[PDB]
Paper text:
Our scaffolding system uses a DARPin (Designed Ankyrin Repeat Protein) as an adaptor component that is genetically fused by a continuous alpha helical connection to a central core comprised of a designed symmetric protein cage with cubic symmetry (12 orientations in symmetry T). With these ideas put together, our scaffold presents multiple symmetrically disposed copies of an adaptor protein whose sequence can be mutated to bind diverse cargo proteins for imaging.
An initial 3D image reconstruction was performed using the cryoSPARC program, focusing on the symmetric core of the scaffold with enforced T symmetry. This map exhibited an overall resolution of 2.9 Å with good amino acid side chain features all around. The 2D class averages showed strong density for the symmetric core of the scaffold.
Numbering used by the authors:
A (entry chain X), B (entry chain O), C (entry chain N), D (entry chain G), E (entry chain F), F (entry chain P): 2 to 119
G (entry chain J), H (entry chain K), I (entry chain L), J (entry chain A), K (entry chain Q), L (entry chain I): 23 to 190
The structure:
Amino acid sequence: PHLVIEATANLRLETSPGELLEQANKALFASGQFGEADIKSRFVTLEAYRQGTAAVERAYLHACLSILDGRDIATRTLLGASLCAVLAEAVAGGGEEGVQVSVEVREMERLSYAKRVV
Amino acid sequence: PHLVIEATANLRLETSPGELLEQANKALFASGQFGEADIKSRFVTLEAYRQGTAAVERAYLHACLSILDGRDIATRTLLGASLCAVLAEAVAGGGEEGVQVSVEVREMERLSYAKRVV
Amino acid sequence: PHLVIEATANLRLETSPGELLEQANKALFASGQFGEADIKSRFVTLEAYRQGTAAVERAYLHACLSILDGRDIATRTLLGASLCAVLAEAVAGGGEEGVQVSVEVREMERLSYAKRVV
Amino acid sequence: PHLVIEATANLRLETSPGELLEQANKALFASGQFGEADIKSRFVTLEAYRQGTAAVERAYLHACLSILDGRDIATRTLLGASLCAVLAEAVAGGGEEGVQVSVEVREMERLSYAKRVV
Amino acid sequence: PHLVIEATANLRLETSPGELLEQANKALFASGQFGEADIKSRFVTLEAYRQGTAAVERAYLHACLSILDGRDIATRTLLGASLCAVLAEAVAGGGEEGVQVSVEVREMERLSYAKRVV
Amino acid sequence: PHLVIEATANLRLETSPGELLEQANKALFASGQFGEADIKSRFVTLEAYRQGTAAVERAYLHACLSILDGRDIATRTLLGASLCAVLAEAVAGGGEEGVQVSVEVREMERLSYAKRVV
Amino acid sequence: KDSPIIEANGTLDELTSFIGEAKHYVDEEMKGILEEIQNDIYKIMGEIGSKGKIEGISEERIAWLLKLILRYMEMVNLKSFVLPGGTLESAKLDVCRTIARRALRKVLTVTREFGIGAEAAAYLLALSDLLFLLARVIEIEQGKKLLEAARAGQDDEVRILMANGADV
Amino acid sequence: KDSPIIEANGTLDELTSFIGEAKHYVDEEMKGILEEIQNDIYKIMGEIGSKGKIEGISEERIAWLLKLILRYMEMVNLKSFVLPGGTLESAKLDVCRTIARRALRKVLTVTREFGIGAEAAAYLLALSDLLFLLARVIEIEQGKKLLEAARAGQDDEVRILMANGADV
Amino acid sequence: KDSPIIEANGTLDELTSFIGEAKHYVDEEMKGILEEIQNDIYKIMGEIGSKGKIEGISEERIAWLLKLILRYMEMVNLKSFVLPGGTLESAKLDVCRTIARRALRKVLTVTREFGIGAEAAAYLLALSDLLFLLARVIEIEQGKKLLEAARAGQDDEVRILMANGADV
Amino acid sequence: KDSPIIEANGTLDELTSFIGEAKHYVDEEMKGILEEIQNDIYKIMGEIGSKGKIEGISEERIAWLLKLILRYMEMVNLKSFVLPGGTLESAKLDVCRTIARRALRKVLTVTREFGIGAEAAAYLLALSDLLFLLARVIEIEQGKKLLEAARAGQDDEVRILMANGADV
Amino acid sequence: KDSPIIEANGTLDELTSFIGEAKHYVDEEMKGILEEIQNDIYKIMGEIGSKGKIEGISEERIAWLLKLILRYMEMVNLKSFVLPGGTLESAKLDVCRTIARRALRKVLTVTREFGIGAEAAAYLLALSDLLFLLARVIEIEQGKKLLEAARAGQDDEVRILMANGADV
Amino acid sequence: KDSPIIEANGTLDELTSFIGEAKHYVDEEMKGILEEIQNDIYKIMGEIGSKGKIEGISEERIAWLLKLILRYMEMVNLKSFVLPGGTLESAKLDVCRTIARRALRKVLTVTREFGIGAEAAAYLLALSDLLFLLARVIEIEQGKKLLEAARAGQDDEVRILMANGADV
């Protein structure tokens, strides 16, 4: 499982960007689907961004969780709904209106996936 | 809809990186498929990059538009062809030969997609 | 073919980040599937990252190769296994235990893919 | 089997309304499909009636035989054609032109049909 | 086509029971499905009737149009909706609340249907 | 739901013809399938009737419950068996032998059924 | 998003565009009728495209069509098999009748698989019997304009009617 | 009552309504041709709707179409891929050609399942080759009206032809 | 020769005949646009009829449609659900939009079985969004001709615009 | 030996074991009712397992259920959507109602393929409407035991009823 | 991950939860038997969920069930069709017998498609014949407690046994 | 009225009856949790039975389950494969977990054919991970009642805990 969290620059978080990833890894491990050391997360801040066509100042947050395939839609819907409740409780605000938080769960292919331990 | 535009460092654009995203959001909204405030774009510049195996200096541009599923192939082909005409009219040049501009349209899954407004 | 290599900050490579991409482009061209100038690679280093829930210092490496669709599973398994042997021979080490190297091969859609040469 | 015979008021029969039902019960029993005491007939005369839109004085006769399902179309066509020859030989005439005699055979459902003997 | 109209005894009609059947035969002939002399109508008044379990005085009206089979659902829905507008414009009222008018269209079987002209 | 109860003239009921319909409407409402004001019942006595071919004096009772379609065979079998127990407890006797009580449950079509409230 | 749903919405959008083209050749009375039919096809398209989750037309609308059909059936004296398009104005309404018969066959496929739109298919069946009667009225008041021009003693004004298709 | 029968009758009723609309823009000679085609489509609709129990068109009718096609093929000098609708009058007959190609594909499905209407589908194939030649004649006699107006020395009467689509 | 190929070519030949009929009611600017669309539908018909063995339209053509759509979207101020066919000229272009939606559903069946014509179906989708915007412009410059006639003090020249469908 | 026969016998054997567990929490009147239901499920299992060759329940038994339902429907005053299991004793009978709805869906598959057991499926439908009414009576006489304990002036004997789920 | 595999594992997980509920009402001897059955259902779930790649139960375990069945068959004197649930403790074990018959029908579908678990389905068949014999023993030693209470001259201690379902 | 809809509603009605039976053995804190789960299963049954036309549970409810799971996961120290039903109270909640896994497999068939109830199946998956953690808490506070009874010097009060299944 790879979790890429992409926040804008004007987004004010209640915690550090490092303590947000510790809460997101505990909420992924508590689903009982992944191993402990196989949950890998990263946080990316964006410098140049636009939302919409209007001139109002906005901010957003987006996570893309990539898991290996072979899990039913009840497991993938629970993983997106467990992560979206973690990110939404970390946003203090940004911009001139509400922050949009969204989480995508996508499936990597299991047959062509290579993995090694150096 | 999320639009991630990835340009190299030697690529010279005719405009700013911010004014390229305003033209790409107006060309996505003019297709009549998405809402106004749901079109979220971001621009990423790359420091370390290689194209090909030859020693000639090259540059490229790449956009990946992620939309929710449930749209036919005529809508996704029009979205990639409307964006590729916006990026190709913004490239002044870079490197020692032609710039390659490409646009991928991929489909997020609608059932496992979470969304909130803080 | 787009190759995005994402390494952490504490990962020590045996070479430069630029010479890693020259070895990965020669191992992609030697499969005989892609053209010469169509192999585009980029290297991204990460500042904020977490692996697992434990407090031990870890590092990882991840590549995501995006090719166009229409190739059988024997070709995609060979492309992930040829790239995972290139990245694992470039890692000197990082963290307090072993480095995890993994390669995902995903398929772009051929009909909605736009491409131009400026 | 229930037989409901509906004649108009201006229709002159060659016999009594009671002797018409004795001839219709003997023609239903002679088909060998029903029991003796299970053939139940009734005769209804109509006070208010209209046939067509023209102002010519008409009369008609109509029988609706309801049998239980499970019989082929050769048995139901014979039951309507055996009854229509009984009613047409009992009509003396009525109105200013020919009398229309018609017989419908409809199928009751066997599973939901209740029956008791007090 | 046979049309059986069953009204209660407390129902006050705006016209005679005979002039209601002339308006219902012109609305059946105007659909262009039946012949002129084959539209046969009858009106039945009821002496003993109950609607519901409550003690409030009610009245109702009901028509059952029996046509031969072989017509699509657009023709049968139009025949019930053309007749229900004729009966509802003839009801002056009855009882202590609103009159319920309903029209059923049922299909006789064409193969077992006998018909003669005396 | 329309309930038409057809008794002969020689049939002696334990109650009035009006109090039989109050017991039949409470046994239809207690199945929980129909609304309160949508249960419409009527009682018809017959003057001219014949049962069988023999000369013995007989009597019968018959109910035809017409409900809208879309209900399984367990619901229609329960509606015929709940009504047949109501009518059989109201028959005192008639004729020279046992009274035959029977209940048919038939299905009206839901698409072509019109209904209005004047 | 299903395959019989997008075909039924495509023909109902095709039918309301042919009515909007044919309502410029009719007089001021029939234009008010055809503009109210165009609103009712828009209500059917919302019902079919949402698979019944939005309410459609009421039974009051089909009672409005059939009360118009019973009015025009008295003026139209029926005759033999007459060819479509006597005049140019009545030729445009004979096209819209055959789109409404094609739209009825698409809505009947939605009914036979999804069980919705049985009151919508009863509107398009009563519509195509009105567009047949609306076309036969325009040929008549064009032809009753010929008998008044024969009695008026006109030389040029009688033959311009015959060049537009007035019956003799 | 079958499903390919009501589709084939619906498109043949659609084709004879487009011909009745397009026969008001043509001259007095081509109106007599298009009114006799409308009678022959009515004979095909009686044959297909009864599944062959009623007699259809004779082979005398297809011998009348092909003797018209061999007459108009001499006047139409063939050229490159020209766009449909040079003039307004020849634009109406290019629509009726494409309904006759759609009606031919419906009758060909009746033939491939019920084995009837092979002489009817040979009429609609010879019809759509006449409506192509009928459209190319009207563009020519509109264009030969331009060369006589150039030699007559007209200033306003030459440009009203070019506003209607006369070729230069 | 296959069955979805002859249906997709039959509707694309039907669409380019309706455009050739509707380009005589528009002005000199929109006639040059509609004559270049007719050439591009002819390039799509060669690509689909040969199952991809002949080259079709380029991506330069779809970049020409969308640069026209972004020009007319500024003039068309969007409003509520307006009925098709305000004027007679904008009623002809609302018919061609619904043929282009029918031609898009036929080309989408060729794509879903033969894998060809995905750039062709992206042309017919951008075409039917231009024919919607082209129809709404003609209703506006007809309506802006009404406000200048109200200020000019005209008695007869203002009501002939309202008889053609100018909005008030 | 068939596949829907062994599933229908397995759920009817599951239903009569849940009734035998739930008849120890009810009083002496309802135990006599539930022990006569257990005999009737045993008669249904003999009829279904032999595919109708053995006689099943009579129509006298369904007339005994519905005469009990009409007795308990007067005491149960209906209310809003109340949760299952107010008391512990009425929680055991809300489980047996949902096994009887599962046993009804298995017998309905035997009826729709073999044509047997339509009088058996009418017993399980009237049974699950009695087990709903039997559960709502026990919550009431537990709650009417609370109002007598409020008037008796009890301190400990009123709260042991509220610990068992008596409604306030 | 297949569809008959997750159904067979779901019912075997349902069966070992009903045994864990029913082992608190039995004495200390039968609790040791039911706790060793719960370990064997856990070995079957590992074999079925891995499609045979993990070893399951041995044939030593089925030889342990049948040596218990031959011991309890001597004490249970067989009688007529007795209703399930004589006492409350023997009513809980008549529920677990009918889950083991449902779990046997799920494992038999895994055997008839994947060819695995034939020794597992022979365990659940011998299990449901032990749970029938285990239920009939508890009704007997409850009833032999009634004959000793009749000879002891007890007034209250004899009727509390009859309130728990002791046979007379 | 469809076949996977009545099976999914029948198992969700079966699950909320087992929760109403098992909420009488738990303390006053866990009874408030189980009574709010019973309201949420009633909201799922309205959404599935109407095929999505009625709104179901919100994403606020799944955020309430997972904030309870993260609270009880700290108290439950995980161990080896322990058998279900250590105590009698924790044996009732191990039955409701296996009904929620069966109800999840029925809702997953509604999702894979009708495309509805993906947020409902994510509730039943988070529910059966709470009922596993709720069962393991009751075995612990029963076992921590044993260590206080060993230090209190009790002879009879320590062994009545071991007769109820307290771990040693």
